[PDB]
Amino acid sequence: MTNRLVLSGTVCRAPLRKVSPSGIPHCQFVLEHRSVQEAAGFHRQAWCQMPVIVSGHENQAITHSITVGSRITVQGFISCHKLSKMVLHAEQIELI
Amino acid sequence: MTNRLVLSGTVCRAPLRKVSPSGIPHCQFVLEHRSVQEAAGFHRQAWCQMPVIVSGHENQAITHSITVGSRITVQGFISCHKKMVLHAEQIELI
Numbered sequence: 735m736t737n738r739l740v741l742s743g744t745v746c747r748a749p750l751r752k753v754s755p756s757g758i759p760h761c762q763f764v765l766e767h768r769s770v771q772e773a774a775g776f777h778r779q780a781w782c783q784m785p786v787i788v789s790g791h792e793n794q795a796i797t798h799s800i801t802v803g804s805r806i807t808v809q810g811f812i813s814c815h816k817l818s819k820m821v822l823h824a825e826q827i828e829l830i
Numbered sequence: 831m832t833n834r835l836v837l838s839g840t841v842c843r844a845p846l847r848k849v850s851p852s853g854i855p856h857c858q859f860v861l862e863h864r865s866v867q868e869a870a871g872f873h874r875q876a877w878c879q880m881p882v883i884v885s886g887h888e889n890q891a892i893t894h895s896i897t898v899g900s901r902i903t904v905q906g907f908i909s910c911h912k913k914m915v916l917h918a919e920q921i922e923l924i
Contacts, residue, residue: 735924736838736903737865737876742831758870769831771907773917774854774885780833780917782910790870807832811867814878820914823869823876 739822741784742807742830743767749788749797761788761797765808765822784808785821796827805830833907835916837880838924839863841900845893856885857893861904861916880904884918892921 747764754760764783771780786808788797800806809826843860850856860881867876882904884893896902905920 735865736836737863737867738834738836739908740832740834741908742833767831767833767908769833769907771833771909771917773907773919774856778909780907780909782908782914811865811876812835812837812863812878813867813874813876818879820878823867823874 737811738809739784739812740807740809741765741767741822742769742805743784745800745802745804745806746783748802749800751797758789759791759794761794762786763788763797763800765806785819786810786824787821788824788827793824793827796829799829800827834905835880835908836903836905837861837863837878837916838865838901838903839878839880841896841898841902842879844898845896847893850885854885855887856883857889857896858883859896861902881913881915882906882918883915884921889918889921892923895923 746766842862845859
């Protein structure tokens with residue numbers, strides 16, 4: 735049922751843009767997250783490079799503010815395909 | 831920096847209790863998620879198999895009750911190696 739990743743980071747690859755044959759715009763970039771997280775009472779570095787996909791006409795405009803160096807937070811669902819790779823499908827983007 | 835994953839699924843690999851060299855036990859299993867999500871006005875299938883690490887003694891009665899086929903909702907932060915793991919903070923048997 736529940737599937738929600740909220741993740742902040744710095745964009746490490748600029749949006750690569752395409753439109754589907756049926757007219758659906760898709761925007762793809764990579765978000766690099768790095769932070770200090772808490773577990774069992776000791777601090778530890780969390781690092782990951784998350785591919786993000788922005789699909790549909792709704793969220794495309796803000797995507798043109800996103801460049802390598804942009805700090806953003808992305809809220810959405812994760813999806814894996816296969817040798818498996820994970821993508822964050824953006825539902826909300828906040829420009830920090 | 832926000833790092834928060836909330837994921838429901840089913841246990842697809844038997845949980846194993848390991849011990850960190852620092853005296854801290856943890857429980858590892860793999861969590862299989864399969865849901866219908868909405869994108870560009872269409873229903874997308876979302877699937878994932880997430881490795882999950884649960885540390886700290888407070889989650890042991892729930893952890894010890896977990897088997898292959900258990901339906902759980904997991905909440906924590908993600909981290910990446912070489913691989914992606916979810917470091918579980920909250921764990922509920924749904």
